[PDB]
Design a protein around this ligand. Structure first.
Ligand SMILES: O=C(O)c1cc(C(=O)O)c(-c2[nH]c(C(=O)O)cc2C(=O)O)c(C(=O)O)n1
Ligand SMILES: O=C(O)c1cc(C(=O)O)c(-c2[nH]c(C(=O)O)cc2C(=O)O)c(C(=O)O)n1
Ligand SMILES: [Ca+2]
Ligand SMILES: [Ca+2]
Ligand SMILES: [Ca+2]
Ligand SMILES: [Ca+2]
Ligand SMILES: [Ca+2]
Ligand SMILES: [Ca+2]
Ligand SMILES: [Li+]
Lengths: 452, 452
């Protein structure tokens, strides 16, 4: 899709909702869920705290704090995945993922691992207990961790793990592994270094499902590959799997996740269109003093090999359902017509989640079969219509709740007339007038939007 | 997708198949079917003849000639739709569509109608009898008739009817009706003038299914709208409906047809990307001597209103699964480096059909879940892979059987190792080196390709 203008974002004020801020100054709140007790549960990525919030009064209790979570002030690591067992009455389990020290790391630049872990909720002591590591030794870095964790209708764990930031900024010269898959030998050794830029599908005990797809002749935890930073993952009522993902300077994506698919990253951003992106592989550059021009591979410094999207020899490439956004090759990523901070003008929205709106007794008129996608950079939440079979999007991503906030997650109440939203404590966001600000209106908040 | 080069087309010679011409004396052969008698049936568009060919021996019979079919030498009208009832043993019906004079027409420039008609097959005399007009008074013209007629798993007729060529060449100043829909009053008077650029869904007696979708508050025969020239229509084994469609100078499409969808034409060609096309509405030009520069609306003469794809206010817009092909706004539709007939290099392939490959006990390796799309202009048959649920394409359109032929239709034998194709009698086609020729290697032929 084509980017909206600053004026088109500014008018998306959602006057048909009442806003109430329930909490602010949470410490990097990240995921929120409607709990089995019809209370709101949310995580703090930086602290490992799991908080429960009463919808009526807003009273908050720190139910548990995941010990030994590692978080860097400038990093996207910490406490990440968070899900309840779907049959919680009979299976009172909470599933998380988190950044933890890796004691066998022999790489001081990458000292941590990601672990997917199960906890048991004890209703009598009202806390979590009896941890069990389901899958450890996963990649960890400060960038593009993703870490969305959901339980599918098949009672498998689906877990997004980002490309760790390879081929940009602090990890510019590390080779991106989004396209790579393990050998049988690596699997035998539990060497999961290729579990970067993937959707994983795990048995509830952490083992490899025997019906997982095969990649390069090996069945592993990998379900799909070729992802950058897929922070959104949600099943539809008819069992399909929708997803949002952050692109580079362009081509954030809404994807339909299909078993064994290849979503193209880093060789293809968005559609395979050779439009506004090319794959510049800095790990293959002649030397590591070369500079990233940050023009999305359309123009690069001498010495870095570039591969057009159309030159990639790919298998099972699956294009996005929608891009937010795609631009022409002649697009100016340094466009001087906004300020010294051109990145705010890049044709992206930085989607942070993806939530399937299920309606209810007070369903919002017209919202049938929609996907809600919060935007960090634009300070909106998108509403994206699909057809009733969730086979295609209809029309465009409709912005809502415009504010100077970085929207991080969103759910709806069971009745469907109330939305609950998390915002980041810090970062940049685009103002009504299109310029950037790092003054956020509601830092680290839980916000309630009630349909009038 | 990005266009293949002339080199890339010329290399698609399919040396793994043996070619044999079965018939070479056909006049504008149009549709090809594997019949319920395990014979090949095919149509001649201008004569109205229905032929049956023994696939083993090659003997042929003219089973029937549809009387009073109207065809213009410079036109795409004539005998079009052709399908068997799916339970032919117990319901020996054949359904056709055709161009016929319209005795009610008061327009000497549009004197004809399209009629969807049923015939009863008499196996004792081997001919068609008892004609019955199921739906009459449909639009007719020389351009963009489409006319694919299939019967779905719901035992409804699905029928493609093109946009009649409005807003180009001889019909430049007629307002395109692809987006328009009937009022209830128009349905009462059987005024089907808005049945242009549609997929229709009809009951087997021609009536309106009671569960057809609503458009602008009215349920009609329309199932989907917003099409230009959709000549390919085919159901998958799991009940999904795939389609191919010719775009203007760009953006031929493979579409997934979903109930109630809007496929965007003429406001959107291909994706809603504002890339290489814009909607120049010559009917809205105040001056009717204005010229169409034929640069796909990117460059226009003074006086014609132009709407960008992103400026359209649309409802239920469904993007294509794949475009053949999409180019940048900087694309040159007049590239003199291509030869004096610059249209031959345009980023299109002119798909003429769409066929779901079902395999069999001699299925061609790697062709699971493929869609075969014949190309008129490039003289190839494309193979397009989808995932096993037919929810997404995988990778690109792979060209096959390159020759100096205009491929019009394609089917496969039950065992899956033989493909049968029809070729046009006349027209232009791209040669190995990219230039244009109107010398076709196999004019008006039924050809088979056998895997060896
Ligand atoms: O303008 C863009 O394209 C853009 C903007 C941002 C932004 O939020 O400022 C991000 C981003 N997302 C996170 C996150 O925690 O999800 C952290 C950052 C960051 O740059 O610090 C990304 C991206 O990561 O692709 N792209
Ligand atoms: O190069 C292109 O884009 C292109 C090329 C052709 C071509 O075949 O030469 C056609 C076309 N298709 C039919 C048909 O019978 O289906 C007739 C014609 C015609 O131009 O006479 C179209 C189009 O109709 O869009 N576009
Ligand atoms: Ca980005
Ligand atoms: Ca992708
Ligand atoms: Ca792209
Ligand atoms: Ca065309
Ligand atoms: Ca279309
Ligand atoms: Ca387009
Ligand atoms: Li005839």
């Amino acid at each position: 899709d084509v980017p909206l203008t600053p004026s088109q974002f500014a008018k998306a004020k959602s006057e048909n909702f009442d806003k109430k801020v329930i909490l602010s100054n949470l410490n990097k709140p990240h995921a929120l869920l409607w709990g089995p007790d019809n209370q709101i549960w949310l995580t703090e990525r930086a602290t490992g705290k799991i908080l429960r919030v009463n919808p009526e009064s807003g009273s908050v209790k720190t139910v548990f704090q995941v010990p030994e979570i590692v978080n860097d002030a400038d990093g996207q690591n910490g406490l990440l995945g968070f899900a309840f067992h779907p049959d919680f009455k009979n299976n009172p389990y909470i599933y998380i993922s988190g950044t933890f020290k890796n004691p066998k790391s022999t790489d001081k630049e990458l000292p941590n691992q990601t672990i997917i872990r199960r906890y048991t909720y004890n209703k009598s002591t009202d806390t979590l207990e009896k941890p069990v590591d389901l899958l450890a030794g996963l990649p960890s870095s400060k960038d593009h961790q993703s870490g969305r964790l959901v339980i599918g209708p098949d009672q498998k764990i689906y877990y997004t793990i980002g490309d760790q930031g390879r081929n940009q900024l602090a990890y510019l010269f590390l080779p991106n592994q989004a396209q790579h898959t393990p050998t049988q030998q690596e699997l035998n050794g539990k060497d999961y270094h290729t579990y970067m830029g993937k959707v994983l599908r795990l048995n509830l005990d952490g083992s490899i499902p025997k019906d997982n797809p095969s990649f390069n002749g090996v069945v592993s935890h990998i379900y799909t590959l070729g992802h950058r930073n897929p922070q959104g993952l949600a099943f539809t009522p008819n069992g399909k799997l929708l997803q949002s993902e952050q692109g580079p300077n362009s081509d954030d994506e809404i994807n339909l996740i299909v078993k064994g698919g290849n979503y193209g990253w880093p060789n293809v951003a968005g559609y395979k269109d050779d439009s506004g992106y090319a794959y510049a592989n800095y790990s293959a550059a002649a030397n590591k003093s070369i500079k990233d021009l940050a023009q999305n591979g359309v123009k690069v410094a001498a010495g870095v090999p570039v591969t057009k999207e159309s030159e990639w020899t790919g298998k099972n490439f699956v294009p996005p359902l929608k891009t937010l956004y795609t631009v022409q090759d002649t697009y100016n990523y340094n466009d001087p017509t906004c300020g010294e901070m051109t990145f705010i003008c890049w044709p992206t929205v930085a989607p942070s989640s993806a939530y399937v709106y299920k309606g209810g007794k007070k369903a919002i008129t017209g919202w049938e079969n929609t996907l809600l996608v919060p935007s960090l950079k634009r300070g909106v939440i998108f509403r994206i219509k699909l057809d009733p079979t969730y086979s295609t999007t209809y029309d465009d991503a409709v912005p809502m709740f415009k504010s100077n906030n970085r929207y991080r997650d969103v759910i709806a109440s069971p009745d469907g007339n109330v939305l609950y939203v998390l915002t980041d404590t810090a970062g940049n966001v685009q103002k009504d007038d299109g310029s950037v600000t790092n003054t956020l209106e509601n830092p680290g908040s839980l916000i309630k939007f009630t349909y009038k």
